[PDB]
Design a protein around this ligand. Structure first.
Ligand code: MG
Lengths: 158, 59, 51, 190, 42, 79, 245, 51, 107, 258
RNA sequence: UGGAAGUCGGAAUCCGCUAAGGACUGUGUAACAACUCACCUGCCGAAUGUACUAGCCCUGAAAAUGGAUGGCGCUCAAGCGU
């Protein structure tokens, strides 16, 4: 009757995420192949992306959900061409994502943000996009964040 | 080519990246590609090793 | 029992892949962890493939 | 630069009697009596207040001013020794050969003696004679533990240091061979 | 009793004061006024 | 080192006449050589040396600066 | 003085703040003064105060200042000549010790009810009185020190053994396991971290924090608040008894 | 240093070579039948060298 | 023993009980020891010690200056010559050395 | 370590080809919308330009890839311009003529197959046919005693010229990658080579401040061109063969005529 | 990357909450955890910190019979400066 919460990192559309999960969920009474099947089914909307997966265990069955992260949301919004990760390595996320999608990602991530306003959330998402290495409106996300701080760009409230 | 192969190998992979506390080498350089080639290579390697031992004993 | 984190498909495929190395050698497949799952509990075309 | 006047103070508890004569300090408390000769240090002792000892140096250099701090700590440690006492707890650990510790008291000299046997299987018997005023007991609350107690902190700590230094591994890798006797705790008896 | 730990473990050591042999030659207010005058001069 | 128990051969401070005369000759030759090098020195030297100024710890430095200011004002007014 | 301690130059990113941080705190407090109806003064004495982040997140419509006490007093204005608002200098008498400011537009009754209902279990700091006796049992040392049952507990990490020895527990390393005495709970009594009614010291509180045992609580005590409309300061129960300066 | 810490393996003696996927019990079997101190852990690639 | 057996022994048994305290006390005594070495070593050993400490002081000053300044090719070449080890590259018909010491026939 | 594709009208990036671990030293755009990249991570990559995706990854070179050349480079640089000098009237006929010239240059055994050559610092070259051979090289060109700096197909597709750092230009058969003859007149590393339009002559510009015109059928030094005061960095031969341009460290453009 | 969560590496190194807290200074883990430093607050309480300069002192290289400020010896000098 005790709920067990396990957080893991998984790639979407793959069954190999349970390989490191099986030695601990085996004694817990879970079927590793079934758990990998539910993980792939939950992460089918995040193909080729590293996502955070939450497993809630109650009476020897696992509920599988995807916890949204800013990095995964930005890389998904970049709309990169599909590729084979075994053969296409050392890739860069150098495409562009518009400020409207940045604000939408901030609205999605409002449940995690401790900022007082959506402007602060947007600046956090712009910093994450700067870390990823993409462009916002064809320019640097640091430059857009500087313009937002200076007041040239207006961010909607809530 | 053989006169420059050593410096070419060291320029490609430095000694600190090959072995040591900061080494980044993960894949070895192999003279075989398939399992059947590996089995054949092991057979001829054992034969050549035995031939070298026999010629050293005879010498 | 596949608590190692890998499928029995993958284990049998790895054995078949490294089988050419086993020429002129003696091969024993040891099925471990019988305290978790026995061989008779397997869904029987797996038993057939192991045979 | 010479400093005209420098001063330190030592509080004295109500159950402590301090007598200073020609820079010889005698401290008496509930636990006993300690003595120390401080005639190697130039200092004027006085009674600035009830229960307060004053120490001063006139026309001294920076070194002479600084030496009063050492004198203050020495006298304070004697006061603490006659009030609460000092206790060092040591632990002896081993890998394969159990270290045997025997504690006796010599009636002729009044000093305790510690005998250490089977230190990494050695056949020699190590003998440490303790400083006078240092009581040694084998602990019953914990495993493989010695307790050293006394009024003189210097005597107790030097006795513990002698016990630690007599059990020294030689010509072996000290990453691998971990046997020895080590000071595990320092504090007051009370 | 003492509430903090001493790093070397000698817990009987008193709470020492800073070694300032020139302490008491100048008051605080005079030093403040001298600070302002020196800043203006500089 | 074991200097106290087993001291070594002492280092003599008694000078010899030969070494004293040699050192005096070398000092004189070094002085003449340094004078020649200063004559032929191509390093740049300022016409006016840099002044250290007035020390900060001098308690009447501000009054001295005031006196300098009034003196230069009077000099500019007279000239 | 040729003989001196060598000063370590830190090769880290963050530098010392200086007077710029003080001026920034002054400007922030003085600019947040006119935007709010009430200014509460609260105290958190001998507490870990890391839950003030959660308090800040919950009171997103309010502003919280937790700064240097004298700097916040000077920002408010300790005298009627230097006060930033009418009657604000009366609030500065509460600014002693570990205190903070809370600018709000909410109801003072709502603020008082929220801070009366706010409760959290926290690790004790040095100086608090121990509410109960804590004893680590002999044998294998577990991660919670015997608070939870050892069947549901996990063995403690082997990297904590020198720290436990340094904090005074006579533990030893037996085949990768930290043990108090023997592996089977023999030849040694249990280790008493603290006794009931004993004033805790920092070694004991560090041991309790390492074993994840909470013997104290986080409680914010409101001392009094100044209202901008009336210009007056209302005293509360904690401010009635707390020393003032 | 690595060569000095290398294990001594005789290629021309009676040898039992234990192989397979990670986390299947190879080190547990070698510990159970020999005196070698090869670690046993639930995570993959616990054994990174020949024992 | 085989592979990383000293690390495994550290993991299973730890170190000697006084290892951390002795290491900390030695690192604390390092300053007195360095001053004693500077004032008490003799001869060629002292000369090499002084040279080596001069080197450490210069390197430490350079590192401190670089960390202080943390918050702040030459000749044009084609693209195929980029990232290669290129040389720095820095009437009276007089030679660079017009006069040298004359060598007598006896020498 | 990237290649960016730009739309010239709008100035924005359509695709970013990434995956190289070193600097992309050379890029080529073939006539079937395949982009070829040679990098300092010892790799030669083929990309589908329409999708912006990776198609081929060749990892045969042992050192930096310096230059890559396509068998259709000469006609792809000039599009519909040719010897006639009357352009077609409309865009459709101009595009048809350009595609016809490309297919005529790139046909191998009756089918269009662009051939690729890569010259590297490992003293070698690799000849590739991605369409027919795929990841297997057609040949490895061996014989340079130092780094190969530049490589170029002849306009008729029968020869390959290569300029190396061993003061030598070498000639190879473009079909099987077999050595033919060594051109030996330079005394410093040869940086650039350029073919004439009729594939009889190749001009080489070297570090010894000279250009040299070679007759490839006799394998001899036809013309010596001195006059550059310092090193020669860039050499081009015009498509109609009237002029050779050279430039380098002496800052002056030199044009050479018959 | 088999694994790599500030701390095996390559490159970036931004924002929020801030009183302040590096996309991290070290210890540590297989990877996490845990500890620690930079930085901040409370206690305390009055002067300090850094770098240079000038004096005197130590080191700044020595062989080989036993010896030399001339010798005794000299330490608020019987040494050094006026
Ligand atoms: Mg395992």
């Amino acid at each position: 009757n005790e709920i067990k919460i396990i957080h893991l990192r998984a790639t979407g559309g793959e069954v190999g995420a349970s390989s490191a999960l099986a030695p601990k969920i085996g004694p817990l009474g879970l079927s590793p192949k079934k758990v990998g099947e539910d993980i792939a089914k939950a992460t089918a909307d995040w193909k080729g992306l590293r996502v955070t997966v939450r497993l809630t265990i109650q009476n020897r069955q696992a509920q599988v959900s995807v916890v949204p992260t800013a990095s995964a949301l930005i890389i998904r919004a970049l709309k990169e061409p599909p590729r084979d990760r075994k053969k296409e390595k050392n890739i860069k996320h150098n495409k562009s994502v518009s400020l409207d999608e940045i604000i939408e990602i901030a609205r999605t991530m409002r449940f995690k943000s401790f900022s007082k306003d959506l402007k602060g959330g947007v600046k956090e998402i712009l910093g994450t996009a700067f870390s990823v290495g993409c462009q916002v409106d064809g320019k640097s996300p640091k430059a857009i964040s500087d313009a937002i701080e200076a007041g040239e760009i207006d961010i909607p409230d809530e | 080519l053989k006169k420059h192969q050593a410096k070419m190998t060291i320029e490609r992979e430095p000694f600190s990246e090959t072995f040591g506390p900061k080494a980044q080498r993960k894949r070895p350089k192999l003279s075989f590609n398939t399992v059947d080639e590996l089995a054949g290579y092991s057979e001829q390697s054992l034969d050549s090793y035995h031939a070298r031992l026999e010629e050293k004993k005879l010498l | 029992s596949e608590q190692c984190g890998f499928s029995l498909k993958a284990q049998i495929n790895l054995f078949k892949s490294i089988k050419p190395l086993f020429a002129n050698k003696m091969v024993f497949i040891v099925l471990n962890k019988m305290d978790i799952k026995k061989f008779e509990e397997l869904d029987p075309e797996m038993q057939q493939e192991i045979n | 630069m010479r400093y005209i006047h420098s001063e330190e103070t030592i509080p004295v508890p109500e159950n402590v009697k301090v007598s200073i004569k020609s820079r010889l300090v005698t401290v008496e408390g509930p636990r006993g009596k300690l003595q120390k000769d401080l005639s190697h240090i130039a200092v004027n002792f006085s009674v600035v207040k009830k229960g307060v000892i004053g120490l001063e140096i006139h026309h001294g250099s920076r070194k002479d001013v600084a030496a009063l701090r050492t004198v203050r700590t020495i006298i304070n440690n004697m006061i603490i020794g006659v009030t609460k006492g000092f206790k060092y707890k040591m632990r002896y650990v081993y890998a394969h050969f159990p270290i045997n510790v025997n504690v006796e008291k010599n009636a002729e000299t009044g000093c305790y003696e510690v005998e250490i046997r089977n230190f990494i299987g050695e056949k020699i018997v190590r003998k440490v004679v303790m400083a006078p005023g240092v009581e040694v007991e084998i602990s019953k609350a914990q495993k493989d533990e010695l307790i050293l107690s006394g009024n003189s902190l210097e005597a107790v700590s030097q006795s513990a240091a002698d016990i630690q230094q007599i059990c020294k591994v030689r010509n072996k890798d000290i990453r691998k061979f971990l046997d020895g006797i080590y000071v595990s705790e320092k504090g007051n008896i009370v | 009793k003492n509430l903090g730990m001493r790093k070397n473990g000698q817990v009987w050591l008193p709470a020492k004061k800073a070694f300032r042999p020139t302490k008491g030659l100048t008051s605080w207010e005079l030093r403040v006024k001298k600070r302002q005058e020196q800043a203006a001069m500089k | 080192a074991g200097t106290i128990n087993k001291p070594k051969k002492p280092t003599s401070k008694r000078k010899t006449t030969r070494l004293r005369a040699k050192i005096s000759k070398r000092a004189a030759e070094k002085k003449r050589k340094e004078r020649k090098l200063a004559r032929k020195n191509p390093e740049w030297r300022s016409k006016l040396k840099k002044d250290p100024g007035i020390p900060n710890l001098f308690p009447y430095k501000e009054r001295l600066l005031q006196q300098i200011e009034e003196e230069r004002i009077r000099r500019k007014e007279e000239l | 003085p040729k003989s001196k301690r060598a000063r370590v130059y830190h090769l880290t990113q963050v530098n010392k703040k200086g007077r710029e941080a003080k001026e920034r705190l002054f400007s922030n407090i003085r600019e947040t003064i006119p935007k709010y109806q009430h200014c509460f003064v609260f105290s958190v004495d001998n507490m870990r105060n890391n839950y003030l982040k959660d308090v800040r997140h919950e009171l997103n419509d309010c502003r919280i200042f937790f700064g240097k006490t004298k700097l916040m007093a000077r920002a408010l204005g300790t005298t009627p000549e230097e006060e930033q608002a009418d009657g604000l200098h009366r609030l500065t008498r509460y600014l002693t010790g570990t205190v903070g400011l809370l600018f709000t537009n909410r109801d003072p009754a709502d603020i008082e009810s929220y801070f009366s209902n706010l409760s959290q279990v926290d690790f004790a700091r040095a100086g608090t009185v121990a509410p109960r006796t804590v004893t680590v049992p002999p044998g294998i040392v577990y991660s919670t020190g015997g608070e939870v049952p050892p069947e549901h507990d996990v063995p403690v990490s082997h990297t904590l053994e020198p720290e436990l020895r340094r904090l005074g527990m006579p533990v030893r390393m037996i085949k990768g396991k930290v043990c108090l005495g023997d592996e089977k709970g023999e030849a040694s009594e249990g280790y008493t971290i603290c006794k009931e009614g004993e004033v805790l010291d920092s070694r004991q509180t560090r041991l309790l924090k390492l074993f994840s045992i909470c013997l104290s609580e986080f409680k914010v005590s409101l001392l009094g608040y100044w209202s901008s409309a009336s210009g007056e300061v209302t005293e509360l129960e904690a401010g009635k008894t707390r020393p003032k300066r | 240093q690595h060569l000095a810490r290398l294990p001594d393996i005789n290629p021309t003696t009676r040898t039992l070579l234990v192989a397979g996927f990670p986390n299947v019990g190879k080190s547990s079997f070698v510990r159970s039948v020999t005196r070698a101190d090869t670690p046993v852990e639930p995570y993959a690639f616990t054994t990174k060298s020949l024992f | 023993p085989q592979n990383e057996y000293i690390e495994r022994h550290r993991k299973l048994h730890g170190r000697r009980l006084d290892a951390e305290e002795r290491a900390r006390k030695k690192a604390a005594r390092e300053g007195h020891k360095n001053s004693e070495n500077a004032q008490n070593l003799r001869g060629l050993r002292a000369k090499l010690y002084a040279k080596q400490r001069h080197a450490q002081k210069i390197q430490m000053r350079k590192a401190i200056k670089q960390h202080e300044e943390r918050n702040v090719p030459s000749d044009p070449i084609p693209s195929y010559l980029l990232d290669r080890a290129n040389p720095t590259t820095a009437a009276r018909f007089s030679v660079p050395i017009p006069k040298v010491r004359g060598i007598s026939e006896e020498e | 370590c990237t290649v960016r594709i730009w739309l010239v009208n709008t100035g924005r990036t359509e695709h970013v080809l990434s995956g190289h671990k070193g600097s992309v030293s050379c890029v080529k755009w073939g006539g079937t919308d395949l982009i070829y990249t040679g990098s300092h991570d010892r790799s030669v990559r083929v990309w589908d330009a329409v999708k912006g995706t990776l198609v081929h990854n060749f990892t045969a070179h042992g050192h930096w890839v310096n230059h890559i050349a396509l068998s259709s480079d000469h006609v792809l640089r000039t599009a519909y311009h040719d010897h006639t000098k009357e352009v077609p009237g409309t865009e459709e006929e101009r595009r048809a003529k350009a595609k016809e010239r490309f297919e005529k240059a790139a046909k191998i055994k009756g089918k269009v197959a662009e051939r690729l050559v890569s010259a590297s610092d490992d003293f070698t070259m690799y000849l590739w046919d991605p369409t027919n051979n795929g990841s297997k090289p057609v040949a490895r060109l061996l014989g340079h005693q130092n780094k190969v700096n530049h490589v170029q197909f002849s306009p008729d597709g029968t020869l390959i010229a290569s300029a190396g750092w061993d003061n030598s230009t070498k000639l190879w058969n473009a079909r099987d990658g077999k050595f033919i003859k060594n051109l030996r007149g330079h005394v410093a590393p040869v940086y650039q080579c350029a073919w004439s339009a009729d594939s009889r002559l190749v001009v080489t510009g070297s570090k010894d401040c000279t250009l040299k015109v070679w007759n490839v059928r006799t394998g001899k030094l036809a013309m010596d061109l001195p006059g550059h005061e310092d090193e020669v960095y860039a050499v081009d031969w015009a498509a109609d063969g009237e002029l050779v341009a050279s430039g380098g460290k002496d800052k002056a453009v030199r044009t050479w005529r018959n």
